[PDB]
Scaffold this motif. Structure first.
Motif, PDB file in Angstrom:
ATOM      1  N   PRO A  97       4.747   4.633  -4.417  1.00 10.13           N
ATOM      2  CA  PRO A  97       5.302   5.134  -3.170  1.00 10.13           C
ATOM      3  C   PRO A  97       6.491   6.052  -3.399  1.00 10.13           C
ATOM      4  CG  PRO A  97       4.632   2.905  -2.887  1.00 10.13           C
ATOM      5  CD  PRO A  97       4.732   3.155  -4.436  1.00 10.13           C
ATOM      6  N   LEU A 147      -0.847   7.858   1.668  1.00 10.22           N
ATOM      7  CA  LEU A 147      -0.108   6.935   0.811  1.00 10.22           C
ATOM      8  C   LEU A 147      -1.061   5.858   0.282  1.00 10.22           C
ATOM      9  CD1 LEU A 147       2.516   6.152  -0.475  1.00 10.22           C
ATOM     10  CD2 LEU A 147       3.055   4.797   1.567  1.00 10.22           C
ATOM     11  N   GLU A 148      -1.922   5.385   1.177  1.00 10.13           N
ATOM     12  CA  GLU A 148      -2.883   4.360   0.920  1.00 10.13           C
ATOM     13  C   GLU A 148      -3.820   4.820  -0.211  1.00 10.13           C
ATOM     14  OE1 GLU A 148      -6.680   2.703   3.211  1.00 10.13           O
ATOM     15  OE2 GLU A 148      -4.948   1.631   4.029  1.00 10.13           O
TER      16      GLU A 148
ATOM     17  N   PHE B  60       9.865   3.684   1.861  1.00  5.95           N
ATOM     18  CA  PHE B  60       8.899   2.776   2.527  1.00  5.95           C
ATOM     19  C   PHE B  60       8.898   2.806   4.034  1.00  5.95           C
ATOM     20  CE2 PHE B  60       9.800   1.211  -1.788  1.00  5.95           C
ATOM     21  CZ  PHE B  60       8.524   0.996  -2.310  1.00  5.95           C
ATOM     22  N   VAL B  91       2.525  -0.939  -0.748  1.00  2.15           N
ATOM     23  CA  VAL B  91       3.351  -0.201   0.239  1.00  2.15           C
ATOM     24  C   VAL B  91       4.257  -1.207   0.959  1.00  2.15           C
ATOM     25  CG1 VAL B  91       3.350   1.052   2.417  1.00  2.15           C
ATOM     26  CG2 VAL B  91       1.834   1.768   0.518  1.00  2.15           C
TER      27      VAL B  91
END
Ligand SMILES: [Ca+2]
Ligand SMILES: [Ca+2]
Ligand SMILES: [Ca+2]
Ligand SMILES: [Ca+2]
Ligand SMILES: [Ca+2]
Ligand SMILES: [Ca+2]
Lengths: 174, 174
Positions: A97, A147-148, B60, B91
């Motif tokens: 991340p 992001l996933e 995040f 995440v």
């Protein structure tokens, strides 16, 4: 695990920005600085870049040799141990991340082909190698990295003992 | 889900440092600032604290509302979506190492009861609420929370839809 050792060696190479054989905060400091100079981005993103890339070392890698330089052997030895506990994966996966945040230079929350290409270029790689890696991460084929998708592929790179398309997450294997 | 939703609301309560009903970068900044006041660590760690804490937002929570302040309902719904794909767990769990790094004021890679206690005190909880949570985390009863112990417990907190010992990870439930 053959291929697995090979992936770690590859990752080590790509992150050892200054190429001196050891991962240090300096690698992330320099990578950031180059990235900030040479990429198109929202003006404020230069600080993000520095914080997020240096945060890879500060919050994660610093725990490997407790503060200093990580040689290739210690890296592999360390990661080897870290992947053993299926319940603590986020200690290995945690940096994804941050990498994502630094690479999203227009901060739209997706990584575009151009942003990815620039990323490969910051790692010293030939931009023509980006598409094959991008394509592996883009599972829904919408032409962007969410992001996933990024963390799922990155997680596969770090954790798979066998061959997968995400073996090239960090470019061509050494 | 009732208990899960309760836990999310509790996390939300905790990180909403000013108590304005919205999670914003300012929450982390003010938390950083108060954290430093309450401990009396060395100079070098002050910056670590700031960097680590704001890093939770920067890397995040910014993924939650493209950068704006997050309301409770937005928070819970996002979380609901995020925890559905276990392959993308990082995440959600990604911040734990960040919090760890902030709380370990003596950068010794371990959290002691003192340190943990300051963290709780910091968050508006009374230090007597701490021991309860500490012991749930200290699975080998060696009176220290290692990084691995911290993320396993934190992960249970975030991911367990059911009751478990770690529901108190962030203190008494609201
Ligand atoms: Ca280096
Ligand atoms: Ca983007
Ligand atoms: Ca996609
Ligand atoms: Ca707030
Ligand atoms: Ca400590
Ligand atoms: Ca322990």
């Amino acid at each position: 695990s053959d291929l697995w050792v090979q992936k770690m060696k590859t990752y080590f190479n790509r992150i050892d920005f200054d190429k001196d054989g050891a991962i240090t905060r300096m690698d992330f400091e320099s990578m950031a600085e180059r990235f900030a100079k040479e990429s198109e981005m929202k003006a404020e993103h230069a600080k993000v870049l520095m914080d997020s890339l240096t945060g890879v070392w500060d919050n994660f890698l610093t725990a490997v040799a407790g503060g200093k330089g990580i040689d290739e052997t210690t890296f592999i030895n360390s990661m080897k141990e870290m992947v053993k506990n299926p319940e603590a994966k986020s200690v290995v996966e945690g940096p994804l991340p941050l990498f994502f945040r630094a690479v999203d230079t227009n901060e739209d929350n997706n990584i575009s082909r151009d942003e990815y290409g620039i990323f490969f270029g910051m790692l010293g790689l030939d931009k023509t190698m980006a598409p094959a890696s991008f394509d592996a991460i883009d599972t829904n084929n919408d032409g962007l990295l969410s992001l996933e998708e990024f963390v799922i592929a990155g997680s596969d790179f770090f954790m798979n003992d066998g061959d997968s398309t995400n073996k090239v997450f960090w470019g061509p294997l050494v």
